[PDB]
Amino acid sequence: ALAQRPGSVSKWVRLNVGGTYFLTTRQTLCRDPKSFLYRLCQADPDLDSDKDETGAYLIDRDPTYFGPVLNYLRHGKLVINKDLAEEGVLEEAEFYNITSLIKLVKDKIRERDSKTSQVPVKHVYRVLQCQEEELTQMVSTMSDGWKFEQLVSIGSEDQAEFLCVVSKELHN
Amino acid sequence: ALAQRPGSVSKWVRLNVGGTYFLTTRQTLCRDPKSFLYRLCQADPDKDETGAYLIDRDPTYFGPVLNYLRHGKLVINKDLAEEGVLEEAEFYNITSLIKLVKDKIRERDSKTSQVPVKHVYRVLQCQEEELTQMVSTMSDGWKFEQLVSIEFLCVVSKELH
Amino acid sequence: SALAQRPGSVSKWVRLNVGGTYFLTTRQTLCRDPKSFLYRLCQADPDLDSDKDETGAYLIDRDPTYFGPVLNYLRHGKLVINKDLAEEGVLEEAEFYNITSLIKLVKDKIRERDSKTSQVPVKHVYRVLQCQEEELTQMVSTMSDGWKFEQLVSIGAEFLCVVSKELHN
Amino acid sequence: ALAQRPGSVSKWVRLNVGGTYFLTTRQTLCRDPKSFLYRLCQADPDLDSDKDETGAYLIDRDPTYFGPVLNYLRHGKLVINKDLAEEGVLEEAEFYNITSLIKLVKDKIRERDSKTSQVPVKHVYRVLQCQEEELTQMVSTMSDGWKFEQLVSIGSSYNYGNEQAEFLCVVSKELHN
Amino acid sequence: LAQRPGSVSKWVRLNVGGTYFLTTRQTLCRDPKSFLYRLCQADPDLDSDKDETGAYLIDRDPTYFGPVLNYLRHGKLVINKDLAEEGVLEEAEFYNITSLIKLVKDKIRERDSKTSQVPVKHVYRVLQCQEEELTQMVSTMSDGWKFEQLVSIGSSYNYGNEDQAEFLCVVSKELHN
């Protein structure tokens, strides 16, 4: 087997998922003994599950959502292309019963769900005040995050000459 | 049948939709006695010499249709146009599903189109000291607009969705 | 050598090899628009036999990526384009296969999504209202249909209230 | 001569690019006589290039980026799918060596490059001034592109000389290409 | 074909997890460190698992192979938009192509800092100016500054006088990389 060490032997297995052929090995299919695929892990002639004439095992499922599943079995990472529905993938995760994966999948969803849905950013407001002699400084030293909103005058020793409304963004 | 109990009913069917092969089972193709797919349902005699029934439809939109049959949830790829899935939902005549799609459509249409942000305004007033109090504890979604000195009038706003 | 037309040049099912991608429909579908060049297959026109592969598929030296939507129009009469798919490319096809009513529906899509996208400077319209202290609260709250409050001004009439409106063309 | 083979002097041609088949006519392969594709442009007597089981001209390139190339050769217009990367097209255009096309590509790249990142807009200002009465006249005639910034009441006076200017209006306008 | 008349050219088909790829032994020599290299020569007594159609079998996801094989073809890293580079990164590591894995991590880190980067800080200044010179002031602000607010400040009786100071003008400027 090209990829593996010379001298070794690999049991290639072909799956026909919903009409699309997938090539992989009995070895990759032992990853999860709780998955019904594990049935292939073990070599068995008196198991004869339905095959097509090329000998590929028949599965009645959408193949487009299968890749990410299979690939989880191959390298432990969940990887979904940007144009693909994770809902679809959650369904295959379940049908093939791979609890570790199902787990990750659900996280991928809430992770990108709390990202999507949220009403315009929340704003906080402060009111600053200063004597006139400290006006320049007050504004030129505006703290890191804040936005100037509005300057107001009072005035008539401690008299508060200028008010200043100032704002900030909240990101969550 | 690999994913099922040993010794089970399970007849495999191939569908050629618009020149794309789709494997499924008579079982999933009977979930609804109303579809035109229900004809394939119970084995009964247009196949290519690959034995696959021929269907004169676009296959890219069939995926979602076949999946509903498969599990009963409606799932659509982002890059995909729900009208496309609607059209097919009707062709094959899957009432329970035709319903679901018009939802997804109308759900994402209320999120799409709602006439420009209608703004509401109000003019709170307050005494000098409770000035901080006011602005500080401003209500859930309101923006500070302007502060006017008379003590003070504070104008505030909020959007409408 | 081709004494007569190819067998099943009149077959119900029809395969199209568009630039290297097979599409499967029925002769019927292709009889939708008599003015169209695809009608030729419908009318079993001898000419085509030059451009029919050996399996039987009709050869078309065009990009297939834009064909499906065209084909589907013929199938069910609605225009449907995938979100990532460029309409200009569909417009080129609609025109090549010369399907007038489609070409039409396509040009609508373009102008519809352009008037949406390319919003040109939102020119504005300002009005300076005047409201006494009292009728201060009412004036803003029940402001006119599409009018943003812009500023409130005072004068020891009591308040001038600038208000605005966005125009979109 | 021996037999009577049809399908010999044929107008159609199939290119197996990186393992995907592409269909076209020998003619389309004549747009740019500089491109090595031109070899198939005409029915070449003595040549004979490497084909596969199915008589397609094997090409060791990515087919996913070939589409635009071929289409250029078809109708002369460059058209790329929104999900595609022009770099990929750029690479192929060079391999097949189609100068006028390569030319079009680098335009598409730099064109959508000057769009992504560019320096924020420079505004411009103006201070209008007007009596109390001419207030509606001021707004009513604000020039085409100007936004209301702020309106200042001057608290108008009983002063000698300074007898002019009840309201000031700061106003603004962007600046573009 | 793509080669000048009378040239050595030995084709190979890779069946990557169910999908076929056409390439040449030539291409699979870019990195003598990758196992793909075992195909660099037309090894007579090799016998790596092939299928019916004599294509070498590989238990990996094809969808992320393109970018790899492409890098082998021309040496540039190319990915489409809808593809996760995390996926590409894996295969880059599986076939073991140092140079590639290198460039792929650049691509991720590049678009990580792009994705999530902090809002823009600002600078504020409060100028004061005579009623008269007020038009001048806003009219001639420097290249990067925005007008923020004007504050009438003197007193009806003083407005227009010289030891005055009639408005305070708040003014701001964005800061960029």
Curated annotation (Swiss-Prot), chain B:
Q: Mind telling me which GO cellular component terms the entry cites?
A: Cul3-RING ubiquitin ligase complex; cytoplasm; cytosol; nucleus
Task: Outline the inducing conditions.
Answer: Up-regulated in peripheral blood lymphocytes stimulated through the T-cell receptor.
GO molecular-function term, one example from the UniProt record: cullin family protein binding
Keyword vocabulary terms for this entry: Acetylation, Cytoplasm, Host-virus interaction, Nucleus, Phosphoprotein
Q: Name one GO biological process term.
A: proteasome-mediated ubiquitin-dependent protein catabolic process
Top-level taxon: Eukaryota
**Major site of localization recorded for this protein:** cytoplasm
Domain BTB, first and last residues per copy: 11-109
List localization entries. Answer: Cytoplasm, Cytosol; Cytoplasm; Nucleus
User: Has UniProt tagged this entry with the keyword Nucleotide-binding?
Assistant: no
Question: What does the record give as the function of this protein?
Answer: Its interaction with CUL3 suggests that it may act as a substrate adapter in some E3 ligase complex. Does not affect the function of Kv channel Kv2.1/KCNB1, Kv1.2/KCNA2, Kv4.2/KCND2 and Kv3.4/KCNC4.
Q: How does it assemble?
A: Homopentamer. Interacts (via C-terminus) with GRASP55/GORASP2. Interacts with CUL3 and with ubiquitinated proteins. Interacts with CRY1.
The domain comment in this protein's record states: The BTB (POZ) domain is atypical and mediates the formation of a homopentamer instead of a homotetramer. Homopentamerization is due to the presence of 4 residues in the BTB (POZ) domain: Leu-23, Gly-63, Val-75 and Ala-81.
* Protein name listed in UniProt: BTB/POZ domain-containing protein KCTD5
Q: Which gene specifies this protein's sequence?
A: KCTD5
From Swiss-Prot, chain C:
Keywords assigned: Acetylation, Cytoplasm, Host-virus interaction, Nucleus, Phosphoprotein
Q: What is its main location?
A: cytoplasm
**Stated induction or repression of this protein's expression:** Up-regulated in peripheral blood lymphocytes stimulated through the T-cell receptor.
State a GO cellular component annotated for this protein.
Answer: Cul3-RING ubiquitin ligase complex
Q: Which Gene Ontology terms cover its molecular function?
A: cullin family protein binding; identical protein binding; protein-containing complex binding
Q: Which residues form the BTB domain?
A: 12-114
The record's function comment reads: Its interaction with CUL3 suggests that it may act as a substrate adapter in some E3 ligase complex. Does not affect the function of Kv channel Kv2.1/KCNB1, Kv1.2/KCNA2, Kv4.2/KCND2 and Kv3.4/KCNC4.
- Quaternary state and interactors: Homopentamer. Interacts (via C-terminus) with GRASP55/GORASP2. Interacts with CUL3 and with ubiquitinated proteins. Interacts with CRY1.
Name listed for the protein in its UniProt record: BTB/POZ domain-containing protein KCTD5
Q: Which gene encodes it?
A: KCTD5
Curated annotation (Swiss-Prot), chain E:
Location in the cell reads: Cytoplasm, Cytosol; Cytoplasm; Nucleus
- What induces or represses this gene? Up-regulated in peripheral blood lymphocytes stimulated through the T-cell receptor.
A cellular component term (GO) from this record?
Answer: cytoplasm
**GO MF assignments:** cullin family protein binding; identical protein binding; protein-containing complex binding
Tell me a GO biological process for this protein. proteasome-mediated ubiquitin-dependent protein catabolic process
Q: Where is the BTB domain?
A: 10-112
Q: What does this protein do?
A: Its interaction with CUL3 suggests that it may act as a substrate adapter in some E3 ligase complex. Does not affect the function of Kv channel Kv2.1/KCNB1, Kv1.2/KCNA2, Kv4.2/KCND2 and Kv3.4/KCNC4.
Q: What is this protein called?
A: BTB/POZ domain-containing protein KCTD5
The source organism is Homo sapiens
The root-end lineage is:
Eukaryota, Metazoa, Chordata, Craniata, Vertebrata
Q: Which residues of the full protein are shown?
A: 35 to 211 of 234
